[PDB]
Amino acid sequence: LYLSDTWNQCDLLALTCFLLGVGCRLTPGLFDLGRTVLCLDFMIFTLRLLHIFTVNKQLGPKIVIVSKMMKDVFFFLFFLCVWLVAYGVATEGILRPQDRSLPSILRRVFYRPYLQIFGQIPQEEMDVALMIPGNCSMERGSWAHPEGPVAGSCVSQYANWLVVLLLIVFLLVANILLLNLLIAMFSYTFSKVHGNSDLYW
């Protein structure tokens, strides 16, 4: 019965990560690993504090309804990650950056279009008209030089209007369809569930 639960698996997890952290910390060759694992352990000891307050009257049933929203969140992540792959690889492909490390491509495909949902839109990294040109490539075609250490050292100018048009379509689908359809699904699920969650609490 102690292993069948979830929050006793949580409180078990905090002490496995604690002893792993201290066990690495006292060894002389693993100081940085022990400090990192303790910093991940503090979040688990903090998230235990949500389960403590489920006995309160005012904050009680609301904390119960938090876990029943994750099926709507997982739909949001499915529709997002498909559309984020599609926009990411197409924009990374029409542009042709010269710095072509593997983690630099993974940053410009998955990390930058993720932050464009939250209003972090770098225009100077992906639009030639806000850039300066230059003879930055030993190759045939027009090339231009953007701002930023990780934005690629030299990027292509051919058919740039399609990159701008993909930026408009991405902000339309992500910041209007997916977010507002997620608010509509949270409203529907909350009114459907709220009765049984009060009885269960």
Binding site: F42, F45, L49, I52
Partner: protein
């Protein structure tokens, strides 16, 4: 022996002491992990 025991005998003050002691555990864990963490 009775009024003292019937303040601290309730489940409320056991809960409240459980919270305050657990918050001080997190405050200590932050003081270690941010200020004095010696190699």
């Amino acid at each position: 022996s009775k009024r003292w025991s019937d303040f601290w005998g309730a489940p409320v003050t056991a809960f409240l002491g459980n919270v305050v002691s657990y918050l001080l555990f997190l405050l200590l864990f932050a003081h270690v992990l941010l200020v004095d963490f010696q190699p």
